[PDB]
Short mmCIF file of N, CA and C (backbone and C1' of nucleotides) in Angstrom, two decimals:
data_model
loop_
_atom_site.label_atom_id
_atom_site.label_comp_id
_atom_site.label_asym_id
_atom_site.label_seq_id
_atom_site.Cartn_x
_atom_site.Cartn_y
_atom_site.Cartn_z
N UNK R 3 0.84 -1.19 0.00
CA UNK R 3 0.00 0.00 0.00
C UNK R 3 0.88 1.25 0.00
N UNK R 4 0.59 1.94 -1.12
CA UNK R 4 1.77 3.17 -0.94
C UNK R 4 0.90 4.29 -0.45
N UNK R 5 1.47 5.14 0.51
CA UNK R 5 0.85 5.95 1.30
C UNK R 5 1.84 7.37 0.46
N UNK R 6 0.53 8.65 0.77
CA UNK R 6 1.05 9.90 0.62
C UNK R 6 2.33 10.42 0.80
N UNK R 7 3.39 11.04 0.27
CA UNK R 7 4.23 11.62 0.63
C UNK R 7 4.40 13.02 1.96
N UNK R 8 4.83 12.79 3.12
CA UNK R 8 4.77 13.36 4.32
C UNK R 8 4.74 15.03 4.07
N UNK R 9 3.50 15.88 4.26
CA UNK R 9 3.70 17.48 4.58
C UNK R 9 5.07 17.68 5.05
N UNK R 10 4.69 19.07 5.24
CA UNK R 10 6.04 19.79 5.62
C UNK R 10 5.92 20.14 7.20
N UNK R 11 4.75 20.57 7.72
CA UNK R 11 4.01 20.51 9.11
C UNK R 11 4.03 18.99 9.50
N UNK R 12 3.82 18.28 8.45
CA UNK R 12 3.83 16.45 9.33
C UNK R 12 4.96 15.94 9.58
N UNK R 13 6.12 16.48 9.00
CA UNK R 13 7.71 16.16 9.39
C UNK R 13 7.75 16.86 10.67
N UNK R 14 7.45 18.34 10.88
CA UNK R 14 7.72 19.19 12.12
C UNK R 14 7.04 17.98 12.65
N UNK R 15 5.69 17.99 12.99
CA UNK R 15 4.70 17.41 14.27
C UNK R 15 5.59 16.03 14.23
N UNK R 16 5.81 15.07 13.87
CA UNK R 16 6.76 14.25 13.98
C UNK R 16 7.74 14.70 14.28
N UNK R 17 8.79 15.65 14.36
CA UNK R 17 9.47 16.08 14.94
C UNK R 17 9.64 16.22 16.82
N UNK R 18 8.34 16.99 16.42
CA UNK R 18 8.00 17.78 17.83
C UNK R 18 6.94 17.43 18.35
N UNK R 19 6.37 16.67 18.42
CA UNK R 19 5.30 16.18 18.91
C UNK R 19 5.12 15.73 20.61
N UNK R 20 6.20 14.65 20.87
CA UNK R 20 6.63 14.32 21.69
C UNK R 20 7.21 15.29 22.88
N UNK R 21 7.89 16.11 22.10
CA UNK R 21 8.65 17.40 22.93
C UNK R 21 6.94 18.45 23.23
N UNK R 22 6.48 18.68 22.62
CA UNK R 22 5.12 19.49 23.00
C UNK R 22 4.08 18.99 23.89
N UNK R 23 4.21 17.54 23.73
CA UNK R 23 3.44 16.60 25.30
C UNK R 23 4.49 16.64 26.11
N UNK R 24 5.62 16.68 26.37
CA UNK R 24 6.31 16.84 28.06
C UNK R 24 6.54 18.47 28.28
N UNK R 25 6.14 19.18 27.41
CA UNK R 25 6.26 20.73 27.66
C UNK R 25 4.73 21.00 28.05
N UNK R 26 3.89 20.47 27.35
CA UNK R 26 2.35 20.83 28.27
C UNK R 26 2.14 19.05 29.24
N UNK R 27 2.40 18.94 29.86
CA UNK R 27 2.56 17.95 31.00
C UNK R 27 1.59 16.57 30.84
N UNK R 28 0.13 16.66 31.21
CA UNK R 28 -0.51 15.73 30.42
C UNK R 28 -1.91 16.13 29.95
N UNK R 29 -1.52 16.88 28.67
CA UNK R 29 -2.66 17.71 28.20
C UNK R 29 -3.00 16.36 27.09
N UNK R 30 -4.55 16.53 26.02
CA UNK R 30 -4.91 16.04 24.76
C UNK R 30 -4.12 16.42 23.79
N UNK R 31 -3.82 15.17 23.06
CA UNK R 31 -2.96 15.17 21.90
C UNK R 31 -3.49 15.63 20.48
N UNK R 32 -4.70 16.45 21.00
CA UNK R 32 -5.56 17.31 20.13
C UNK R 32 -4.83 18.63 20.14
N UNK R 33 -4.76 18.61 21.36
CA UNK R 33 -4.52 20.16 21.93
C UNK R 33 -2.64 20.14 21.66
N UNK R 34 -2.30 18.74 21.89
CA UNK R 34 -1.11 18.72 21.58
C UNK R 34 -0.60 18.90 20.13
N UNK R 35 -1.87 18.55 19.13
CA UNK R 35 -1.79 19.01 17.33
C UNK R 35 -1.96 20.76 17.84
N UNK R 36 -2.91 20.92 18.29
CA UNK R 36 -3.05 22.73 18.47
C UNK R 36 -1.83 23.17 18.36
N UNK R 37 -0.94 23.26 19.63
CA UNK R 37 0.21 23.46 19.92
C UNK R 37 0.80 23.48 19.28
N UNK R 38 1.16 22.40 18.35
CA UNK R 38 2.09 22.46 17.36
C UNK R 38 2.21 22.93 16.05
N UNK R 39 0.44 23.40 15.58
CA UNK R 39 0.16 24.53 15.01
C UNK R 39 0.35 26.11 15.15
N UNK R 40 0.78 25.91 16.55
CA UNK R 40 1.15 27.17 17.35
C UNK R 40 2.61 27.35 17.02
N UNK R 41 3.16 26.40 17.59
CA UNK R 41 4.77 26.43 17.09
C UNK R 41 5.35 26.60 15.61
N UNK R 42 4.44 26.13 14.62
CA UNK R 42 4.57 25.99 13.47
C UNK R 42 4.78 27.47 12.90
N UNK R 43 3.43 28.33 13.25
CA UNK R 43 2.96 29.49 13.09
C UNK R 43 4.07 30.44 13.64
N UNK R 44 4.66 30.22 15.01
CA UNK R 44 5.76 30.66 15.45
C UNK R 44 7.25 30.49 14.95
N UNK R 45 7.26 29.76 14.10
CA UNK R 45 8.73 29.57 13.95
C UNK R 45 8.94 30.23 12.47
N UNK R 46 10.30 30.62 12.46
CA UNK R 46 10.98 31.59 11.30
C UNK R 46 11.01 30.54 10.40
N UNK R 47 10.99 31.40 9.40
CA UNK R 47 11.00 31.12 7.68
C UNK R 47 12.16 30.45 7.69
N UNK R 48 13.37 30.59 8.31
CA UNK R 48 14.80 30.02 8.82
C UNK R 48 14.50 28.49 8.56
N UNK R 49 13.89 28.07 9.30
CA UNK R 49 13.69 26.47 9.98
C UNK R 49 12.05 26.26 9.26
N UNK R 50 11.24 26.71 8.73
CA UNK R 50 10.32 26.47 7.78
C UNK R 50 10.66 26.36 6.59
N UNK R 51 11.72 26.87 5.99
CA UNK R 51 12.09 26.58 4.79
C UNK R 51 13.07 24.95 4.76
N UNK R 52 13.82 24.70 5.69
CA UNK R 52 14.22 23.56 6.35
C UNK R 52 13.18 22.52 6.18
N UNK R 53 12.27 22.62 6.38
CA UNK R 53 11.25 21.33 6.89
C UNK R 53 10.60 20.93 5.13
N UNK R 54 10.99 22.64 4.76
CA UNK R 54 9.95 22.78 3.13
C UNK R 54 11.25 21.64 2.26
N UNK R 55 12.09 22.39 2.29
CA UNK R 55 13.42 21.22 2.09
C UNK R 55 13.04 19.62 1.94
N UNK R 56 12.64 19.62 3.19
CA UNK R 56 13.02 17.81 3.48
C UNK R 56 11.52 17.71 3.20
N UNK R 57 10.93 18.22 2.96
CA UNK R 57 9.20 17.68 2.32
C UNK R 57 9.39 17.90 1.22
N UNK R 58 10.62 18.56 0.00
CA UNK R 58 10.71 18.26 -1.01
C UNK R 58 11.69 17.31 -1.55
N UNK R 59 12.69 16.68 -0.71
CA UNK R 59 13.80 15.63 -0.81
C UNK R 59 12.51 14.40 -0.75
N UNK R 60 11.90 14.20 0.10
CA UNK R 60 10.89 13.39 0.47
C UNK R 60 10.41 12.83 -0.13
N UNK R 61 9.69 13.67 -1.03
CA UNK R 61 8.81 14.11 -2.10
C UNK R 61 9.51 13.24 -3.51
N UNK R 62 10.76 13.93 -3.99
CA UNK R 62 11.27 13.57 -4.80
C UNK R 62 11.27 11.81 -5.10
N UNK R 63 11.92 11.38 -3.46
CA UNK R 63 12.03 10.06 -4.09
C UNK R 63 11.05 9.00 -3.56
N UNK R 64 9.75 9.98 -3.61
CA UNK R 64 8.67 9.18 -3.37
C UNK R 64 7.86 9.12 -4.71
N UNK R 65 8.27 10.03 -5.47
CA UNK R 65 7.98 10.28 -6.83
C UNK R 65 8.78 8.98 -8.08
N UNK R 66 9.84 8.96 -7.49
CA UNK R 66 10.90 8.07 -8.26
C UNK R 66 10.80 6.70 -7.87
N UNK R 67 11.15 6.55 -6.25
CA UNK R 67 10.72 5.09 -5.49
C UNK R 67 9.36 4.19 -6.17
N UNK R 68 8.46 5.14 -6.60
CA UNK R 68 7.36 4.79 -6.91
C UNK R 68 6.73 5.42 -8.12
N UNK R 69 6.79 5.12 -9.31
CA UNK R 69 6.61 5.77 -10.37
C UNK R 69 5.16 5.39 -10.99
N UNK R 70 4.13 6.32 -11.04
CA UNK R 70 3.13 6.13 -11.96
C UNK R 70 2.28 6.00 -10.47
N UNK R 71 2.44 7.23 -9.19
CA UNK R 71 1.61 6.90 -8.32
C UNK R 71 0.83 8.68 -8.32
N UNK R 72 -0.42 8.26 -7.52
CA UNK R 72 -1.40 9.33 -7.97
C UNK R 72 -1.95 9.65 -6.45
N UNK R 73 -2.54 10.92 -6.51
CA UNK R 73 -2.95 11.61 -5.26
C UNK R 73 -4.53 11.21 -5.18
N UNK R 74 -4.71 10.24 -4.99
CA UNK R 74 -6.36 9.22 -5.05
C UNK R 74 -6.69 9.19 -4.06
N UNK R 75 -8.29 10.31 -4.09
CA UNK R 75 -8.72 10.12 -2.70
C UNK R 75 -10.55 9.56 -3.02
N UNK R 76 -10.39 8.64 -2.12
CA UNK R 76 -11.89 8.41 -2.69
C UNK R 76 -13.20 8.91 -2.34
"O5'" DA E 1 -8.72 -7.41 20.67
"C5'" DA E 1 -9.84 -6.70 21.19
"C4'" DA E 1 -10.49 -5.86 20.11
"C3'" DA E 1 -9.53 -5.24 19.11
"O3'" DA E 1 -10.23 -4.94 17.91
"C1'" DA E 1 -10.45 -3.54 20.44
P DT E 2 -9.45 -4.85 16.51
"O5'" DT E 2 -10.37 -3.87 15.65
"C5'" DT E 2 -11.75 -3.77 15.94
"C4'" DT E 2 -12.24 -2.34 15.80
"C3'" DT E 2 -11.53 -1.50 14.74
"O3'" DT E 2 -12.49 -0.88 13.91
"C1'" DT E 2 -11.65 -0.32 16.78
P DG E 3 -12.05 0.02 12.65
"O5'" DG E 3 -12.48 1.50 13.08
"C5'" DG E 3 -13.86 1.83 13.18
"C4'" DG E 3 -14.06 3.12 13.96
"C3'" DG E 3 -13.72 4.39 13.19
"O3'" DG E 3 -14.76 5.35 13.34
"C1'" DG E 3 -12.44 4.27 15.22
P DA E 4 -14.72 6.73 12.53
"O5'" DA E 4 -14.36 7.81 13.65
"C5'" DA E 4 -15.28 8.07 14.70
"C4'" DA E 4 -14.83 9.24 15.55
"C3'" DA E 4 -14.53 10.53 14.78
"O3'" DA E 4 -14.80 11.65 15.61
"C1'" DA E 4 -12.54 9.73 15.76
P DA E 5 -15.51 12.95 15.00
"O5'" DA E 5 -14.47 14.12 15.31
"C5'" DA E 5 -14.00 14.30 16.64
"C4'" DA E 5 -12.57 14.81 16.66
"C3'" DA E 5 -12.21 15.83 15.56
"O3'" DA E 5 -11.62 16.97 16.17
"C1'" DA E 5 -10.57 14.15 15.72
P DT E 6 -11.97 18.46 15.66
"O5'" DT E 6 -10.77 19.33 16.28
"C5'" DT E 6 -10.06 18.82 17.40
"C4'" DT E 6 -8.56 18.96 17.21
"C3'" DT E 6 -8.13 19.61 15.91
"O3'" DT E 6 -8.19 21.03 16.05
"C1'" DT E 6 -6.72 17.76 16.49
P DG E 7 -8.08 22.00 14.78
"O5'" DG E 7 -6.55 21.88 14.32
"C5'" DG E 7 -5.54 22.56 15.04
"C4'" DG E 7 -4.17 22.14 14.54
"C3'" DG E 7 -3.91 22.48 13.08
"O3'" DG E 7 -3.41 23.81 12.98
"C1'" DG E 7 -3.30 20.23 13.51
P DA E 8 -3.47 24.57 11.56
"O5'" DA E 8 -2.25 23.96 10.73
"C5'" DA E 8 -1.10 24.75 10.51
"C4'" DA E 8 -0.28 24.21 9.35
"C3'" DA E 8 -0.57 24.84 8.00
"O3'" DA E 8 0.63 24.96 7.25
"C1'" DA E 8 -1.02 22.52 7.90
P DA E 9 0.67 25.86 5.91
"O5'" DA E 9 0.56 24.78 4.74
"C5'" DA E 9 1.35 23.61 4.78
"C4'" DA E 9 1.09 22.73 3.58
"C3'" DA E 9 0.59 23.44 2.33
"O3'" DA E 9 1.20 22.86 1.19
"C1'" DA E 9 -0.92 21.75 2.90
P DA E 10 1.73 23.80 0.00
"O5'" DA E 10 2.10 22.78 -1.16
"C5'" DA E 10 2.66 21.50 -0.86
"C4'" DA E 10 1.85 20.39 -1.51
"C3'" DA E 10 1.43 20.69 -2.95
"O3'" DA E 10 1.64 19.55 -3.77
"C1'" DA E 10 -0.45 20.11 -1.64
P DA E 11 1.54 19.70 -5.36
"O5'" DA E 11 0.18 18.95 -5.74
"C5'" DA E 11 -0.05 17.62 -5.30
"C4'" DA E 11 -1.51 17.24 -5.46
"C3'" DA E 11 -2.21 17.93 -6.62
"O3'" DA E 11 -2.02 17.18 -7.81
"C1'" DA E 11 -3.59 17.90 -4.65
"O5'" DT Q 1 -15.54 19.62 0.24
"C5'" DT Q 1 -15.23 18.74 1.31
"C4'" DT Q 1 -14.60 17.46 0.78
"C3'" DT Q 1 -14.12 16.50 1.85
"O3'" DT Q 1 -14.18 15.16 1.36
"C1'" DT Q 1 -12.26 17.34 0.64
P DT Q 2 -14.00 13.93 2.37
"O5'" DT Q 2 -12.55 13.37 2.03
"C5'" DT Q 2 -12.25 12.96 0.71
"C4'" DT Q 2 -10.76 12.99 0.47
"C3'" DT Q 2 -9.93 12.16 1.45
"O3'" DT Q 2 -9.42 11.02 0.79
"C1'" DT Q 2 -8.91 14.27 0.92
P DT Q 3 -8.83 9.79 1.65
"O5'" DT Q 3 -7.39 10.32 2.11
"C5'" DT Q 3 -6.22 9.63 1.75
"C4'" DT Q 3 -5.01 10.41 2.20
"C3'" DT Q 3 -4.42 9.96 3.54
"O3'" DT Q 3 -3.05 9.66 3.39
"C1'" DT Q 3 -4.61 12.30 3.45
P DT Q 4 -2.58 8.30 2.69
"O5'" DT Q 4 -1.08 8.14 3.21
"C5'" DT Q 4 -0.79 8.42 4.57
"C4'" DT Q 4 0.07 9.66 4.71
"C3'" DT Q 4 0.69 9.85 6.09
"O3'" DT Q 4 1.90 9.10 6.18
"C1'" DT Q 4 -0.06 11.93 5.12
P DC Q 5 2.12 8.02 7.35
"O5'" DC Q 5 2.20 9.01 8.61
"C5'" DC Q 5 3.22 10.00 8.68
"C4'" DC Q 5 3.63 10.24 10.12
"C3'" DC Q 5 3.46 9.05 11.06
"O3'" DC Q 5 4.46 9.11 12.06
"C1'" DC Q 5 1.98 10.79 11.71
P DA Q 6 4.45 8.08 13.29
"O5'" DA Q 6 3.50 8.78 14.36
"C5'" DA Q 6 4.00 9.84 15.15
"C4'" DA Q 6 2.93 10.33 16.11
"C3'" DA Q 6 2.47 9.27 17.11
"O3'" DA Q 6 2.56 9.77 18.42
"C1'" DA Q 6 0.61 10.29 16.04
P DT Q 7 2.76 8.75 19.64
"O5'" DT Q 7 1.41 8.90 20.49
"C5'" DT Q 7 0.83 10.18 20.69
"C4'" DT Q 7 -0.61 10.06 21.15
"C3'" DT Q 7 -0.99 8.68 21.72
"O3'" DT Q 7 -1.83 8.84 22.85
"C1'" DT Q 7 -2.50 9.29 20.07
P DT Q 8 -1.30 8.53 24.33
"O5'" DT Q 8 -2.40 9.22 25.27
"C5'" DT Q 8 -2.43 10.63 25.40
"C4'" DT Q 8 -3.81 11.18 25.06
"C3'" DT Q 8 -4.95 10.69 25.95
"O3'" DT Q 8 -5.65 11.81 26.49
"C1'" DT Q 8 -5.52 10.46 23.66
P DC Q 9 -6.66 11.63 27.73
"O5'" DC Q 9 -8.08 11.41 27.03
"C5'" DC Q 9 -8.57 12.40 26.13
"C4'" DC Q 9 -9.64 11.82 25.23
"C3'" DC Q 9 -10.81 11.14 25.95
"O3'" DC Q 9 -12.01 11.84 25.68
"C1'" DC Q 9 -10.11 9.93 24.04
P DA Q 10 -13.32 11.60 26.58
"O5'" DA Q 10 -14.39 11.02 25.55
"C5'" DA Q 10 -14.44 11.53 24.21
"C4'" DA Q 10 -15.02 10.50 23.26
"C3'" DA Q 10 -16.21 9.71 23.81
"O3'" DA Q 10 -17.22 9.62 22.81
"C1'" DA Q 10 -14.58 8.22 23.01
P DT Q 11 -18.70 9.12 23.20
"O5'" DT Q 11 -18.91 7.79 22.32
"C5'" DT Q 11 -18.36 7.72 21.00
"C4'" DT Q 11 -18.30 6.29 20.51
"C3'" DT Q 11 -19.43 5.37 21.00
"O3'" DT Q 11 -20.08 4.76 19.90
"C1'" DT Q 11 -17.33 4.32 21.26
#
DNA sequence: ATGAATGAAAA
DNA sequence: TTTTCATTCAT
């Protein structure tokens, strides 16, 4: 089953996800996506262009790894 | 034990 | 609107 190639926010939240539940102690991992929409929103073009990077390296050889695959949603 | 909903975005 | 990750929470 070949799955979507990973956002650029879904590399961060994989990133940081973990670190945003022991920084809010034991909050919902709803609130813990919030958050990290928060952080996202907060962080410089610096380290957003970084993440845009590796969601386009990603990208690339998910394009190549897998050739003749389509954005099919049903 | 299985599904819902929270977040950004490219499609 | 759909779905990529992750996961508490609700069913």
């Amino acid at each position: 089953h070949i799955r979507r190639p990973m956002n650029a926010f879904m590399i961060f939240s994989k990133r940081h996800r973990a670190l945003v539940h022991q920084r809010h102690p034991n909050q919902d991992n709803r609130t813990v996506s919030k958050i990290l929409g928060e952080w996202w929103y907060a962080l410089g073009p610096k380290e957003k262009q970084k993440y845009h990077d590796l969601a386009f390296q990603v990208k690339e050889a998910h394009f190549k790894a897998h050739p003749d695959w389509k954005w099919c949603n049903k």
